[PDB]
Every structure is written in C-alpha cells, then in structure tokens.
C-alpha cells in the first residue's frame with residue numbers, strides 16, 4: 001500500500017544537494033537520488049519547497065510524505081521520525097575569510113558573529129556550546145542568507161555541512177575570498193551519522209521501499225554515475 005504520489009519536502013537553498021536552477025527547476029544530488037529512487041519504487045513523486053525548520057513539522061502534519069534535504073540521522077530526530085539507510089555522509093566545518101585566525105573553539109569565537117541554519121544540527125550544537133558562553137550565534141531561515149551576510153561582513157564565520165560550503169560557496173565566484181577555518185567539527189551526539197530520507201515512524205512500508213531502491217541503485221553502479229556528476233571524492237563515506 002505505498003501511496004500513488006509521494007510528496008517530498010526539500011529546502012532548495014543547499015547547493016549542491018538541493019537548489020533551484022535559473023528557471024526555478026529543483027536540481028542537485030538530493031533531487032537526483034530521490035527521482036531515481038521514486039522511479040525504482042514505481043510511485044509518482046512531487047517536490048515541495050519548504051524552509052528547513054518546517055520540514056519535520058510538515059512531515060508529522062502529513063503535508064509531505066518524505067524529506068530529502070541533507071537530513072542528518074541523529075539520535076534526537078530518531079525519537080520523532082524514521083529514516084532510510086544512509087544516503088551520504090555529512091561532516092560540519094566552519095568557513096570564514098581567507099587568512100582568518102578563527103578556529104572552531106570558544107576561545108577563538110567569543111564575541112564573533114556565527115551564522116547557522118535554524119533547525120539544523122549546527123544550530124543545536126552552536127546554541128549549546130557557543131551561544132551560552134557568549135559567542136553571538138545567529139540563526140537564519142535559509143543558508144543563502146548566511147552566505148550573503150558573510151560576504152556582506154555581518155557574520156565573521158558560518159557553520160554548516162562541509163560539502164555544501166565547499167561546492168556550494170567556496171568554489172563559486174562569491175566564495176573566492178573565503179575558506180575553511182579549522183578542521184571539521186566532530187561531535188557524534190550532535191551531528192548524527194550521514195543523511196537519510198526522513199519519514200513518519202508509522203510509514204514502515206514506504207521506508208522498506210526507499211531502502212530497497214537505494215540498495216538497488218547503489219548495487220548497479222547508478223549511485224557512482226550520479227555522484228560523479230557532482231563530486232570527485234567518496235561522498236558516501238563508510
């Protein structure tokens with residue numbers, strides 16, 4: 001009893017995973033994986049754009065059926081929703097101006113302005129560890145606003161998923177005077193283990209379907225043909 005139309009929510013401001021091209025078409029590795037999986041599940045899928053913090057609200061409100069939006073599988077989100085198996089890995093890393101002395105430490109960030117996406121694992125992390133100790137953590141509705149405020153000099157640093165910062169901003173004309181500041185921030189409690197399709201706990205059949213289609217496209221070389229369109233490194237991880 002899979003639905004005949006599966007409505008997938010995504011926040012289209014996170015290139016290379018989910019964004020809009022020049023005519024408003026949804027494009028990116030998340031879109032490609034979702035379309036390919038829908039194909040193999042034999043269901044129709046509609047893509048719905050939403051701000052990132054409304055996506056899990058909308059899933060439990062039954063406005064959408066699935067989330068494919070670089071959604072990290074974390075212990076916390078698992079108490080509310082279910083996930084497919086890992087779609088790819090995602091570590092977090094800071095970016096700041098090239099030649100910034102900044103490092104992901106409280107010592108370095110006290111009194112700095114740090115942007116984080118509202119609702120992400122990075123907002124949770126920075127709120128707890130940095131906002132409480134006086135770092136000025138600013139939560140934004142979408143990641144594009146973050147990159148603009150950074151280039152505008154309103155933010156001193158931004159914390160987000162490393163591949164999205166790299167391919168989505170640092171390798172773009174706008175990110176040439178910026179760079180990663182320090183190494184990847186690793187915290188198992190906060191950042192979870194890779195990303196996955198987010199689903200209602202009770203939609204067990206839909207979870208089995210996405211997982212099966214995912215095993216199949218990985219098994220026949222499609223995942224690697226698809227990822228090579230975006231990445232020259234092993235995006236899936238372990």
Ligand SMILES: N[C@@H](Cc1c[nH]c[nH+]1)C(=O)O
Pocket residue numbers: 011014052069070071072090117119120121122160161195
């Ligand atoms: N992976 C992080 C960051 C993110 C995903 N999408 C947009 N931002 C999360 O799931 O919160």
